[PDB]
Design a protein around this nucleic acid. Sequence first.
RNA 1: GUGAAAUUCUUGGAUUUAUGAAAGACGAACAACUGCGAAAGCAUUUGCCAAGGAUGUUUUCAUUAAUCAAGAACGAAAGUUGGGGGCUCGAAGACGAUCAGAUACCGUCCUAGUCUCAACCAUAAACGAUGCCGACCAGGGAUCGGCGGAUGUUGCUAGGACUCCGCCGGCACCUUAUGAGAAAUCAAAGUUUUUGGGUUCCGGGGGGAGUAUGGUCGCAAGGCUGAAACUUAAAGGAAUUGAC
RNA 2: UUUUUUUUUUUU
Lengths: 98, 132, 61, 84, 216
Amino acid sequence: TFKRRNGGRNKHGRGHTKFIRCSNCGKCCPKDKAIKRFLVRNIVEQAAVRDVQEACAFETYTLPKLYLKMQYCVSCAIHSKVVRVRSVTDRRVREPPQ
Amino acid sequence: ATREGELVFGVAHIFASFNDTFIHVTDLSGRETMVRITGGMKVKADRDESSPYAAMLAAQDVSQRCKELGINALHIKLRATGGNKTKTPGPGAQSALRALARSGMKIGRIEDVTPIPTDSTRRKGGRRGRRL
Amino acid sequence: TKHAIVVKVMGRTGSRGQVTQVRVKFLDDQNRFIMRNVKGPVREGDVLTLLESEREARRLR
Amino acid sequence: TLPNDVDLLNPPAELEKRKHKLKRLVQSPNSFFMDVKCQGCFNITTVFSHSQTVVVCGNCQTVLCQPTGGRARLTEGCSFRRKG
Amino acid sequence: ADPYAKKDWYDIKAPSVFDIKNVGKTLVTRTQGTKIASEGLKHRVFEVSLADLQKDEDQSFRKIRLRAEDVQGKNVLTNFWGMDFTTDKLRSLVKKWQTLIEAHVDVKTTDSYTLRMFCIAFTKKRPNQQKRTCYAQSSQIRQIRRKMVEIMRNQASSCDLKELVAKFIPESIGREIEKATSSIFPLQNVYIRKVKILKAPKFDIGKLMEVHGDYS
RNA sequence: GUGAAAUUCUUGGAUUUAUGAAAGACGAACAACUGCGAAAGCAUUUGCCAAGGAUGUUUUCAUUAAUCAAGAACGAAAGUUGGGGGCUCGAAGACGAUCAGAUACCGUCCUAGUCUCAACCAUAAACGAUGCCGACCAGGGAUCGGCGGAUGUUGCUAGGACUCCGCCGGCACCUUAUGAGAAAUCAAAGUUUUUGGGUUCCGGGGGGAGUAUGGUCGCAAGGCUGAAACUUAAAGGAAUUGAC
RNA sequence: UUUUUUUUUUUU
Ligand SMILES: [K+]
Ligand SMILES: [K+]
Ligand SMILES: [K+]
Ligand SMILES: [K+]
Ligand SMILES: [K+]
Ligand SMILES: [K+]
Ligand SMILES: [K+]
Ligand SMILES: [K+]
Ligand SMILES: [K+]
Ligand SMILES: [K+]
Ligand SMILES: [Mg+2]
Ligand SMILES: [Mg+2]
Ligand SMILES: [Mg+2]
Ligand SMILES: [Mg+2]
Ligand SMILES: [Mg+2]
Ligand SMILES: [Mg+2]
Ligand SMILES: [Mg+2]
Ligand SMILES: [Mg+2]
Ligand SMILES: [Mg+2]
Ligand SMILES: [Mg+2]
Ligand SMILES: [Mg+2]
Ligand SMILES: [Mg+2]
Ligand SMILES: [Mg+2]
Ligand SMILES: [Mg+2]
Ligand SMILES: [Mg+2]
Ligand SMILES: [Mg+2]
Ligand SMILES: [Zn+2]
């Protein structure tokens, strides 16, 4: 039985899509199928922000940010709980969680 | 060197991997090493070399040693393993940075210098990845 | 060895819920808050003796 | 428009204009011929609205229109009148 | 034996193009036998933030490379050796749902400095735009790249290294590129992302001392 | 380096830091329910070389067309022969672990290979598991290319960017049944016992078996074509409840 | 993300 209309990927009007390597296990996975997340977080964790600011060597300074694009295979994405198994009706929802 | 409040800046190259932590301090050019304390020099078990506590101890030792060499402030160069491997810093990065901040050292510029390929050689593990 | 007062209790922590995570405010410095894991019953208004205040508590689970 | 709300033999002129030229009840082109005059020369030339060639006035040897993807673009000086 | 007890400290001096001359301090082992301290400091490269050189936090996204050219007394006289963006700045500029345009050109200055300049730009949405993307067509991208290359070559070839760095500091070339390319597509965050020195002229003390004041 | 370790490298200085050089791969982010191509496939710049769809056309020919045995062109990856390359990773192999064993999963080092040229090979879940051409058949919002119309801005040079309304063509999506279906589902898998638009291929319970034999292609690996004796009551599809 | 192999024949 077929469970997804898109077959678990995002390929339309296309023959082949080159793969990426899973950021967790290194497994090959088509890019249109890999679960991709973009993480933008402060280099200094919120706990240490005050201590680092108190030790600033300049009158003013804005702490940088860390940018990471994570590309997971299906297995790692499920195991890491990046995505979860949804009900038959709920897995047709494509909007990101609020 | 002239005034007590004058700031002498070094560069702290922090290599926080998932197996170890490095706290390497050099001059501005980077050609001269001041102190290099790793997390594996502060623990007994190989599994604790990258722990936050080992990073904190290494950072405390680094700050203590640098204070004797006339270094007041440090620039931060945080990196992960990079290459085709993980770009996420190890658990010891934040602990080392906090310990350096809390040890009386002034913090300068903070930069992420993880080596990022515009495109890389093949990553290890085969096309099926690490199977566990 | 510093003294901190519990301001609020975040909840139970650990596989068996053995420890409770709390937010404690240092008495000497009233503007510094830290995260600690506490063993044994604890409520708001309690004072703990921190043998070392450098560490930050993380969920044991 | 609902099918029973319109007459297939007497469609409103707006709908016929909006339809594709070949899908109208009777095929009819959207092109036309125009009388283009240069700015300074009294000579008058007929030009196709969708000319594929650079039409040049014989007298002054000036380009009147430039071929494009669809309708030809006239030179700024020249003006045109719909001929038909 | 302590190796730091036989090391002397030196002062790094920036060229005149920058407001601040004192960049920092570096040390080298004292001269012993054939090992000359002055040779250990020669051609050293220091990466310094433009915010420190200009004392302006708005320039903290630019990193400047200064190479040690000569040593006089306890001062190391440097000169411009390239510039780059910080990683966070570049990561912040690149975003989805927009087009990224890059160009490079190899140019020579009037001083015989052969350098490679790298330009970056992004398409900009209009204030009344309703569609969710601002994508330029490939032909438009090629036209923009042509304009970028032409402007960069014209700007670099008509000036020396000193005036080129003077142009870099306020980002005049990027402003010119944005003004010129607007007729093709609106652009934002137009910058000279990176400059690297390919070839440098034979060292001349006279030229070096023109950008460094008297230290005595 | 791992769950933890060990194999391994290390005061002949490992790892780490800065600068520089060489080599060979790979072209991140941008990058999408987006594009091009017959499919396979195709992502750094610039030039050259031919090719192409769609759009526009009050241009030309005038049935020249559709689909196709035989026969041809191309055809991922792996593999073959011989050069060139040989960074990375890495079949085989060798070690270190784990284990009752562990010819594995994990770790360490590596041959062929991975790249390119010349010549072969012709197979993939080569998938939309869904032939091509043509007609009709509900609605809606997005998006790519071209074109028509309207309108107001732009640190720009009539144009370009954006806004609105339309036509054609394309990749898709959402809703719905008056349709179909064993259903899952499908706006084509509809217009089918109220059965007929044209045309190619191709299945006939499950195994034996894609095997034997013959032929043919290939250096080989194998490809294409392709049985029978005998055996058997089910195998199998979709969906429901429970249990796990 | 350590390790976890197996349960005679028919029938209820
Ligand atoms: K399928
Ligand atoms: K997916
Ligand atoms: K370790
Ligand atoms: K090799
Ligand atoms: K091997
Ligand atoms: K076992
Ligand atoms: K083959
Ligand atoms: K498929
Ligand atoms: K459309
Ligand atoms: K029986
Ligand atoms: Mg299933
Ligand atoms: Mg394919
Ligand atoms: Mg170790
Ligand atoms: Mg698993
Ligand atoms: Mg296991
Ligand atoms: Mg356009
Ligand atoms: Mg290097
Ligand atoms: Mg594109
Ligand atoms: Mg790229
Ligand atoms: Mg060979
Ligand atoms: Mg290897
Ligand atoms: Mg090959
Ligand atoms: Mg086949
Ligand atoms: Mg359009
Ligand atoms: Mg049969
Ligand atoms: Mg058994
Ligand atoms: Zn994975």
